[PDB]
Write a protein that binds this DNA or RNA. Structure first.
Ligand SMILES: [Ca+2]
Ligand SMILES: [K+]
Ligand SMILES: [Zn+2]
Lengths: 117, 618, 341
DNA sequence: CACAGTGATGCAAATCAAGTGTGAAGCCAGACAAAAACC
DNA sequence: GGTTTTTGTCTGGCTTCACACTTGATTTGCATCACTGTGTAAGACAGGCCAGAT
DNA sequence: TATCTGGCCTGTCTTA
């Protein structure tokens, strides 16, 4: 974005308010009123010259039951938490290293007929 | 800056133009509708649309606020493919274009339709025969089988000049029944019977067979096949159940001669006249069929095992093919009837009083008499004794009448009477060939002027349908001087049109009871008219079909209840599908044409697939 | 050995592969028509005479006491010495194999028209199952006459036969069959020398011995280059059959055999391989105890015969063969030649 | 160097479906000011 | 220039969403194969033959 | 007499 003179004015006012009132949560609709009154010929010149610098910056910027691996994975999730993408890497390695997966595939075999029907 | 159109503006820009109306809307919602700006704008928009008669946009927005997904189940896509005659290659073009323009996969891709086909084709459903079928494999996953059935083809053997594909008969029947299951259940229900009732159902199957000419041979390597085909088909005609001491009509085919229900069983490229190749290919089909007469098919329908007994009726055969396969002589012979032993001369003198005596069983005996000559007779006496049965039958047919070819032959005959009544042959016996040609030319030109018929080389069903009317006799009378013969022609056609409905309607008893009642009476006066006022043509001779039509129509009607429904016209209509499917629904190569057409022709005949196209007509 | 083209009459369609020719006193006759007999010729048997390279097929009639045998393809045919012909097995137009046997004999020859007698011969004992592509010959031993029958093919037996392979064919067991026509009984012999089944071979019969040449074995699918001698002894007691292999045998199936002179025959035609026709011809010289097979000069075949995949023929009798090759199709289906010796 | 198919095959490519918390994008609020078109 | 309308910026936190990997299995996309049909009647010109013309 | 154009016939050639 590119910032107008009035906009730089508003940002500086917000900074002053935050340093004066650290524990204070500003309301938006009241702040625009008081800021607009402050804006409404010498105070503004600083902000006016600041705005063109911002313009230059803008130029630079312009240019189905689960797979047996899933069933195994889900149960081993808590242990890994005790030890997502990282968890899945660990799950896959240990599953690959493991008759070990015959029971999980049997559960999947019961589930496959149920999916089909 | 002239105000742009509202739709062009960016979100920020349209907000500023409507912020005045937006705040006004927030009031109305808090005041009247509980602060539901969403629901009050949705309703105002939907109502703005229908106000401008734009219901489709409103209705779709409704379906997308509800959010329900749109897609067609594969078996429904299949039905749309099969029944609108789209090819997979063409359907693929539609599917691809729909998915890319709507971003949604409304139609399914071809691999899933190809999977939905599997249910509908023979070999998918399990079954068993008690007792097991003789000489038939009990395997139940047999789909398309080679039609040569292991025919020897080594260069020593007889030369194999045909390609053929088929279904195993039983395996096909099973797939037909499973296709009909919903119509069998609904048929019990409407007869107030138990859905789960499983008693001995009985299936009556119409069997049809036909040769085609003008089947072009493809280029490319293969057997040098002849340019003809043969088709064996069956139509499921009715199913009754035995509930008490009643036979309850669970199902009867509404449209018995439609291509929709003539199911293909055997496609071969071969000549019906070539007996050696014909028996080689169809003998396996007949042996499967003989076995099924002696067994009961137990098959699982809706969770409950059911038993089916089968009756096979071969009636979809033209006379020429019937004579060929039941060892009879060719249609020129003196033994004109395939239903009785009468002689061409006898049929002209008596005309009407002849009963059905021939049968597949009798013909088999007579061939054996022919072959063995047990009274050591002369060939004349031998032939007289077996009444022309001098070859061994190989296919069992019902002794009946094909209404299609009957309708055609008879019209072809009348067309000839018309010519000879124009040359006044009743009065002048001798006429030159040139003098005869002009009689036909006169009548041809006149049928064009008065009836809008163009001349055709070979007689047509629709021509016959249109020619055999009293209005056409009117036309023809404008060319005959003598009104004594206007009378004769009018009567002859009145009698014929009193007779025709009997042998063409599905249920003469319900549809033309008085025509059925009077048939024996009407056929007598028809016969007498030919004998007296048409002596020149019908003294000492009669056409095969005039005989069949005058002498056997009533007995057939009481033995079977109908003639028209057992006609070939449905299987003939199937040929039209053969030609179309060979061009537009098959791989175009000699070693896949027959099977691709057979499988896709079966799908076209599936009632489960047809039902999806009457969904609109709930 | 001159090759000669032949023209044919209106009923050229009758002639098909598997047809048979029989010789009665120099008059040739034709049997085994395509399709069932028609009202033009009810017997299916034709006077087959070639006059100036034009062949006319004319119908012949049967005697009152005759059977009307069906047209048969690839039956075993034999000549019996009073001259008569034996037909055993073969295919009917309905593709059935007939187990029957028929005898063809001249009944009457008034005014150069022949009436035939066709009688069925009943056969009991060890009857050979219905067959085609098999040889049958008559041997003479010790003033006694005996019929020999060997090889061929049939369909699977009813127990194993299935509709899906309804037409599948297998070689018959290679049992030599003695068949005495006088009594109507048949005796079977199993021999160690004859282990494989064999069909479409040539059979030559001299005195008490029959030579088996070439043929094709379905299980092996080989056209073996073997010669088998089979001697039959007819003593007062039960006859004995002894077989001998004799190397130097021709390798050919479906070959045609003609007799040029007493004791010398020519073997022409047939197939060396499924796709290779046998263009050479062999000469057989017979000795009371010896058989001689000699290479002879090949005939001047035309480019049609050379490039045909299939050819079929039968022996006319006076050392002349009637050959046929598949012809152009719209015209006539087959092209016929006559080869003289 | 005609050309748009004709259906089944089989291999590549996409997709699925589960676990949760990152950041990114759009949005609201009042008031005022860039740009970009017209008298 | 004066005037009219499109597009914003200023802020904190609201939601919704896509993404983050891995594994095995489905589901889609796509090229491949040898072959299809639409090309599909009548006039020009020569040379032999014999009757009626020269 | 002794030829002699013309139709007539068939059959091939060229394009469809
Ligand atoms: Ca037909
Ligand atoms: K129709
Ligand atoms: Zn009759």
């Amino acid at each position: 974005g590119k910032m107008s003179s009035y906009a730089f004015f508003v940002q500086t006012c917000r900074e002053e308010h935050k340093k004066k009132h650290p524990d204070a949560s500003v309301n938006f609709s009241e702040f625009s009123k008081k800021c607009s009154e402050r804006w409404k010929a010498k105070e503004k010149g600083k902000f006016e010259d600041m705005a063109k610098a911002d313009k230059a910056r803008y130029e630079r910027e312009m240019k189905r039951p689960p797979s047996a691996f899933f069933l195994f994975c889900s149960e081993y999730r808590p242990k890994i938490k005790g030890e997502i993408g990282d968890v899945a890497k660990k799950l896959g390695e240990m599953w690959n290293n493991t008759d070990d997966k015959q029971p999980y595939e049997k559960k999947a075999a019961k589930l496959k007929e149920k999916y089909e029907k | 800056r002239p105000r742009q159109h509202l739709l062009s503006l960016t979100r920020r820009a349209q907000k500023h133009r409507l912020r005045e109306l937006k705040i006004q809307v927030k009031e109305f919602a808090d005041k009247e509708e509980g602060g539901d700006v969403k629901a009050v704008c949705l309703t105002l928009f939907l109502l703005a649309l229908r106000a401008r008669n734009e219901h489709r946009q409103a209705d779709e927005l409704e379906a997308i606020m509800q959010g329900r997904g749109s897609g067609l189940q594969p078996a429904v896509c299949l039905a749309i493919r099969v029944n609108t005659f789209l090819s997979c290659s063409q359907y693929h073009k539609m599917y691809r274009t729909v998915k890319a323009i709507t971003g949604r996969q409304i139609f399914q891709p071809l691999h899933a339709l190809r999977n939905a086909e599997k249910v509908l084709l023979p070999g998918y459903h399990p079954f068993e025969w008690q007792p097991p079928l003789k000489n038939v494999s009990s395997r139940t996953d047999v789909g398309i089988i080679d039609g040569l059935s292991g025919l020897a083809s080594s260069v020593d053997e007889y030369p194999v000049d045909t390609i053929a594909k088929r279904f195993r008969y039983d395996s096909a029947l099973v797939s037909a029944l499973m296709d009909m299951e919903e119509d069998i259940l609904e048929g019990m229900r409407s007869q107030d019977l138990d859905d789960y009732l499983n008693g001995p159902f009985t299936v009556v199957v119409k069997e049809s067979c036909d040769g085609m000419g003008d089947v072009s041979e493809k280029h490319g390597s293969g057997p040098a096949v002849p340019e003809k085909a043969v088709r064996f088909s069956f139509t499921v005609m009715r199913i009754t159940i035995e509930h008490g001491s009643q036979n309850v009509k669970v199902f009867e085919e509404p449209k018995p001669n439609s291509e929709l229900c003539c199911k293909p069983l055997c496609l071969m490229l071969a000549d019906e006249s070539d007996h050696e190749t014909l028996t080689a290919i169809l003998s396996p089909l007949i042996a499967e069929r003989e076995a099924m007469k002696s067994s009961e098919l137990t098959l699982e329908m809706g969770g409950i095992p059911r038993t089916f007994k089968f009756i096979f009726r071969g009636t979809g055969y033209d006379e020429k093919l019937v004579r060929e396969v039941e060892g009879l002589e060719a249609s020129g012979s003196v033994y004109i009837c395939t239903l009785c032993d009468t002689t061409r001369l006898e049929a002209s003198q008596n005309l009407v009083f002849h009963s059905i005596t021939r049968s597949h069983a009798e013909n088999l005996q007579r061939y054996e008499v022919w072959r063995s000559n047990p009274y050591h007779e002369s060939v004349e006496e031998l032939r007289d004794r077996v009444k022309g049965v001098s070859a061994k039958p190989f296919i069992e047919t019902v002794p009946s009448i094909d209404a299609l070819h009957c309708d055609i032959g008879n019209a072809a005959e009348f067309y000839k009477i018309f010519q000879l009544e124009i040359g006044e042959v009743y009065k002048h016996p001798n006429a030159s060939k040139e003098e005869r040609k002009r009689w036909q030319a006169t009548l041809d030109k006149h049928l064009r002027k008065r009836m809008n018929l163009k001349p055709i080389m070979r007689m047509n069903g629709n021509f016959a349908r249109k020619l055999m009317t009293q209005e056409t006799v009117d036309a023809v009378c404008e060319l005959i001087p003598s009104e004594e013969r206007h009378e004769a022609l009018r009567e002859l056609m009145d009698l014929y049109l009193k007779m025709k409905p009997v042998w063409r309607s599905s249920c003469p008893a319900k549809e033309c009871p008085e025509s059925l009642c009077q048939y024996s009476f009407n056929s007598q006066r028809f016969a007498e008219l030919l004998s007296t006022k048409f002596k020149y043509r019908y003294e000492g001779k009669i056409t095969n079909y005039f005989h069949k039509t005058l002498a056997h129509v009533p007995e057939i009607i009481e033995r079977d209840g109908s003639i028209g429904a057992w006609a070939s016209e449905g299987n003939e209509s199937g040929n039209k599908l053969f030609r179309r499917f060979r061009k537009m629904n098959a791989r175009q190569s000699k070693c896949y044409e027959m099977e691709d057409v057979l499988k896709h022709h079966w799908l076209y005949t599936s009632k489960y697939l047809q039902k999806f196209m009457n969904a609109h007509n709930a | 050995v001159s090759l000669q083209m032949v023209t044919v009459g209106h009923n050229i369609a009758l002639i098909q592969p598997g047809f048979s020719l029989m010789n009665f006193d120099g008059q040739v006759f034709f049997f085994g028509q395509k399709g069932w007999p028609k009202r033009s010729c009810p017997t299916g048997v034709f006077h087959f005479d070639i006059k100036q390279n034009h062949l006319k097929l004319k119908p012949a009639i049967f005697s009152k006491d005759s059977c009307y045998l069906p047209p048969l393809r690839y039956p075993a045919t034999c000549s019996y010495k009073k001259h008569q012909y034996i037909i055993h097995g073969g295919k009917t137009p309905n593709n059935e194999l007939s187990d029957k046997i028929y005898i063809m004999s001249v009944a009457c020859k008034n005014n150069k028209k022949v009436t035939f007698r066709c009688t069925e011969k009943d056969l009991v004992g060890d009857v050979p199952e219905p067959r085609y592509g098999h040889s049958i010959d008559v041997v003479y031993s010790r003033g006694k006459s005996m019929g020999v029958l060997f090889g061929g093919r049939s369909y699977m037996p009813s127990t194993q036969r299935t509709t899906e392979k309804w037409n599948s064919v297998a070689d018959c067991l290679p049992h030599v069959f003695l068949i005495d026509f006088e009594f109507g009984c048949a005796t079977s012999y199993i021999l160690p020398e004859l282990q494989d089944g064999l069909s479409f071979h040539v059979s030559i019969a001299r005195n008490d011995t029959v030579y088996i040449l070439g043929g094709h074995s379905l299980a092996s699918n080989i056209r073996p280059a073997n010669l088998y001698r089979i001697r039959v002894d007819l003593p007062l007691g039960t006859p004995a059959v002894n077989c001998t292999v004799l190397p130097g045998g021709i390798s050919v199936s479906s070959a045609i055999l003609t007799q040029t002179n007493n004791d010398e025959f020519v073997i022409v035609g047939g197939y060396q391989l499924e796709n290779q026709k046998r263009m050479v011809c062999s000469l057989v010289s017979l000795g009371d105890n010896t058989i001689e097979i000699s290479e002879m000069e090949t005939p001047d075949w035309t480019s049609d015969i050379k490039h045909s995949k299939i050819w079929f023929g039968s022996n006319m009798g006076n050392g002349t063969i009637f050959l046929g090759i598949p012809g152009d199709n719209k015209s006539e289906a087959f092209y016929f030649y006559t080869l003289r010796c």
